[PDB]
Amino acid sequence: TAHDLIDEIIQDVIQLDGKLGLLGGNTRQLEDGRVINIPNGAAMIFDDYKKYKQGELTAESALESMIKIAKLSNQLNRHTFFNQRQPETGQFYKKVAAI
Amino acid sequence: MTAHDLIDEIIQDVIQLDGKLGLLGGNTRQLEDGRVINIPNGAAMIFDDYKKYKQGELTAESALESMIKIAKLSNQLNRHTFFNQRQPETGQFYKKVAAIDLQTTIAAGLRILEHHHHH
Numbered sequence: 321t322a323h324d325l326i327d328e329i330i331q332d333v334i335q336l337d338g339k340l341g342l343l344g345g346n347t348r349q350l351e352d353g354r355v356i357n358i359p360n361g362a363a364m365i366f367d368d369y370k371k372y373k374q375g376e377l378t379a380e381s382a383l384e385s386m387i388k389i390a391k392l393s394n395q396l397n398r399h400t401f402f403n404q405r406q407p408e409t410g411q412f413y414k415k416v417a418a419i
Numbered sequence: 420m421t422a423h424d425l426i427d428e429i430i431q432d433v434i435q436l437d438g439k440l441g442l443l444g445g446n447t448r449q450l451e452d453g454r455v456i457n458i459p460n461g462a463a464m465i466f467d468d469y470k471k472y473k474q475g476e477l478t479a480e481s482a483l484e485s486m487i488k489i490a491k492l493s494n495q496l497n498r499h500t501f502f503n504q505r506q507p508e509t510g511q512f513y514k515k516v517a518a519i520d521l522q523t524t525i526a527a528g529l530r531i532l533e534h535h536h537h538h
């Protein structure tokens with residue numbers, strides 16, 4: 321399902337918690353209450369998961385932009401020593417850009 | 420100084436760091452004219468905020484705020500024994516920028532942060 325594919329992707333975003341360089345990070349709260357600190361691309365995707373569950377986007381349209389975010393993130397490798405992308409985050413953007 | 424002109428001043432200084440010793444590596448960036456520079460990690464993130472400003476993603480004030488935040492952290496790291504002898508040009512850069520009082524400079528004419536020193 322398009323729906324179940326989305327709930328896959330945000331289960332991956334959860335596990336990118338604390339996978340940050342020396343600088344940077346994005347705080348997002350769950351429905352669980354738990355706060356997580358995640359990379360820029362993964363945060364932009366988490367935001368599209370919110371719009372979806374808030375009836376602002378369809379599953380189809382949410383998943384489209386999610387994949388489009390991942391593809392742009394995959395291309396970006398401008399990172400310095402102080403804000404390195406972790407390998408776990410790199411695999412996530414590759415996986416999601418595949419779909 | 421306008422915020423715009425302060426940014427242009429900082430980035431002229433970043434360009435002069437081309438080739439100078441970063442002990443934690445280097446970062447290639449390309450100028451608008453096409454020329455490629457190799458600069459340290461703090462200068463490179465400062466350069467990236469300049470780009471975000473030029474693309475209209477940040478205001479001049481918001482760009483300078485993070486530029487100065489990065490130069491403060493980079494200056495603190497540069498005072499360590501590992502780094503504080505062998506990268507002087509990089510040290511002077513991060514020291515100048517970290518000493519900018521932004522909100523006072525936007526009042527006025529470059530204004531510096533007034534503070535106590537043990538001396």
Ligand SMILES: O=P(O)(O)O[C@@H]1[C@H](O)[C@H](OP(=O)(O)O)[C@@H](O)[C@H](O)[C@H]1O
Pocket residue numbers: 339340341342343344345346358359360361362393396402403404405406409
């Ligand atoms: O905002 P920054 O200071 O650049 O911080 C980096 C970004 O959040 C990166 O997001 P990305 O993977 O989507 O590029 C992340 O992977 C890094 O670990 C952070 O250090």
